Amino acid sequence: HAASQMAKPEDVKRRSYRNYGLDLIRGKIVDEIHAGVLEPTISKVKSLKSALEACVAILRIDTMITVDPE
Amino acid sequence: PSNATFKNKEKPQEVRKANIIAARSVADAIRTSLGPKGMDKMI
Amino acid sequence: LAENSGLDPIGTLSTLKSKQLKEKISNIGVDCLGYGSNDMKELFVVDPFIGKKQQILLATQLCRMILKIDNVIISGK
């Protein structure tokens, strides 16, 4: 995945198939186009963006107060 | 010429000491929550 | 000394500052015996130089350690 930004994308030169990313059987590097696995952008945008803003609230916590039921 | 004194009870702060310490624990709580650089809490 | 003699701590510093500063005599101090003069030269209060020098130096050398204390580990006696 480094060949994308390493080589100049405006100059083409190939060396980059983009995705690659996984294979669940043979344990090899296979493009997602040939594998046929894609997901909507909403699976990332408005997902991790909402999760990151939710997780940083835990780091904001300083003390903890617990009140047992009477 | 000395005179002066005027002490009687020797622990006037004893009642007002631990209460400030109890108030300092509450005061130290808002110090971490003060300003945009502060922190949040959970209750 | 102003606590036992019943003197104002604010007036204690103001009394010695108006004297020991302008006048080169440093003998002005707190009088706990209830006399009419604060001069130690007339009241005969004498401390040894090299003796009191050690009392001042050894008191400052104690802070070379305590001030640096961070973690304390106490093993079972």
Q: How far from chain centre, in Å, is Cα B13?
A: 11
Whether the Cβ atoms of residue C27 and residue C36 lie closer than 8 Å to each other = no
Residue B40 dihedral angles phi and psi, to the nearest 5°:
-105, 175
First-to-last alpha carbon distance for chain C, in angstroms, is: 41
Residue at token pair 């036992």: C4
A67: Cβ contacts below 8 Å, ≥ 6 apart? B43
Two tokens at B31?
């110090």
Is the Cβ pair A57, B33 closer than 8 Å? Answer: no
Å resolution of this model?
5.6
> C6 at the B interface (CB within 8 A)?
yes
Q: Half-sphere exposure of residue A28, counting CA atoms within 13 Å on the CB side?
A: 6
**Strands B40-42 vs A61-64: parallel, antiparallel or unpaired:** parallel
Which of C6, C34, C36 lies closest to B5 in CB terms?
C6
* CA separation for the pair C9, C14 (Å, rounded): 9
* CA separation for the pair A47, C69 (Å, rounded): 48
C14: amino acid identity, one letter: S
Two tokens at A12?
């083409």
Residue at token pair 């001042």: C56
> A58, A60, A64, A67: which to substitute to probe chain B, counting the most B Cβ within 10 Å?
A60
C31: number of Cβ within 10 Å:
19
B10: Cβ contacts below 8 Å, ≥ 6 apart? none
